[PDB]
């Protein structure tokens, strides 16, 4: 019955800045309402709750406001620890509810991905299938789009990617599409490119290869 | 104060699994989960009110959540297992905290247990196939490290000598129910052909250690 969601979803802050997120719940929940903090795979710490009350060592620039469908969390001057997810929970005599969570990450200024493209080894090919791996390096901020292109064709459902956390120096990611044909299909076409978007560049930037060249 | 889970599980679909929170010096014990890449999710837990057990609508029929006051010991058992319950499943003290004009509130209060891991799979430990991502200023390399279960898989480079430029991949799970990565480096172009790049593929639940060198294909 009860529905949490939060946003933003992401939220990209500089060490020292005044940071606010929200959780909205569909129908009031009163100040029955926590706040959480989630370091990627580790268990989550106790915040606040009853929407405003600090949990006992917490440190005091965690703040959280609001009552009834609409509550914040506020940061008042975001320190390096504080790089996490943070969720919202609506709890009560019979269950708890967690929002979906906001991500912060550190700002850092726009940098363009450096983009490869990497046609299947002949050795995998002699097993069978043909994985192409296109592999955006060192970019920021983190929304990037990757679109895979077969003799123009646009592909849709045949890729997987995978991101890097972002790195420890110089406040990057990076990314990995991976394509996976049948090695029957993948000797049915001869242009395999990989066209990459992101703010960091005025144009999209393409890579490619033609098979067996 | 300590709660101390039992250890990662794979599992059969259809399935089920009991995981076990032993609390550390009676509490009611909660359970909750976070499947790759996604939120936190309440399963269920005992209620500190009633002492019986309160589940999540979308389990309920599903858990069972029990408690061996004798041990300390709560457990969360799911059955019916499907490839969406593969995730950690945390526990945490479910505390009375506050009361306000007669009604009392908890909370899942700290420290939670460090999660058990609960995989569910048909696959058969696995270890990988390994291809080169053959290299074509700075250029880019690496190797592909397909085809294993379950996780994880360590990559090095040049036995440890090359660490800076490295990229090594979250695995993705494939549509077969095995993992694959990739781990990339970048190094200068005018090193290539005079330097050898290997890469060092380590997977320990199948023992099997793989080196392959990566150079630019004739």
């Known amino acids: 019955d009860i529905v949490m969601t939060q946003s933003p979803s992401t939220l990209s802050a500089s060490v020292g800045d005044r940071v606010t997120i929200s959780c909205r719940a569909s129908?009031?929940?009163?100040?029955?309402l926590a706040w959480y903090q989630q370091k990627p795979g580790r268990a989550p710490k106790l915040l606040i709750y009853?929407?405003?009350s600090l949990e006992t060592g917490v440190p005091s620039r965690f703040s959280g406001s609001g009552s009834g469908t609409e509550f914040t969390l506020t940061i008042s001057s975001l320190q390096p620890d504080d790089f996490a997810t943070y969720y919202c929970?609506?709890?009560?005599?019979?269950?708890?509810?967690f929002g979906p969570g906001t991500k912060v990450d550190l700002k850092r200024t726009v940098a363009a991905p450096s983009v490869f493209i990497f046609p299947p080894s002949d050795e995998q090919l002699k097993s069978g299938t043909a994985s192409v791996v296109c592999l955006l390096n060192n970019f920021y901020p983190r929304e990037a789009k990757v679109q895979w292109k077969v003799d123009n064709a646009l592909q849709s459902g045949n890729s997987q990617e995978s991101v890097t956390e972002q790195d420890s120096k110089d406040s990057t990611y990076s990314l990995s599409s991976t394509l996976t044909l049948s090695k029957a299909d993948y000797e049915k076409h001869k242009v395999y490119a990989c066209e990459v978007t992101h703010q960091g560049l005025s144009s999209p930037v393409t890579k490619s290869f033609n098979r067996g060249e | 104060v300590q709660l101390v889970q039992s250890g990662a599980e794979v599992k059969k679909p259809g399935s089920s699994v009991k995981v076990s929170c032993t609390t550390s010096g009676n509490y009611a014990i909660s359970w909750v989960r976070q499947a790759p890449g996604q939120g936190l999710e309440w399963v269920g837990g005992m209620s500190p009110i009633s002492n019986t057990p309160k589940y999540a609508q979308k389990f309920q029929g599903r858990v069972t959540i029990t408690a061996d006051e004798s041990t300390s010991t709560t457990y969360m058992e799911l059955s019916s297992l499907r490839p969406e319950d593969t995730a950690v499943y945390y526990c945490?003290?479910?505390?009375?905290?506050?009361?306000?004009?007669?009604?009392?509130?908890?909370?899942?209060?700290?420290?939670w247990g460090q999660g058990t891991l609960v995989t569910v799979s048909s696959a058969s430990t696995k270890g990988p196939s390994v291809f080169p991502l053959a290299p074509s200023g700075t250029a880019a390399l690496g190797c592909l490290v397909k085809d294993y279960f379950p996780e994880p898989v360590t990559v090095s480079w040049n036995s440890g000598a090359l660490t800076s430029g490295v990229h090594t991949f979250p695995a993705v799970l494939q549509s077969s129910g095995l993992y694959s990565l990739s781990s990339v480096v970048t190094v200068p172009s005018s090193s290539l052909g005079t330097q050898t790049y290997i890469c060092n593929v380590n997977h320990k639940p199948s023992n099997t250690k793989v080196d392959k060198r990566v150079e630019p294909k004739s």
């Open positions: 129908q009031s929940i009163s100040s029955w």
């Open positions: 929970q609506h709890y009560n005599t019979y269950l708890f509810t």
């Open positions: 009853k929407a405003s």
């Open positions: 945490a003290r479910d505390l009375l905290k506050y009361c306000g004009g007669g009604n009392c509130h908890s909370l899942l209060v700290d420290p």
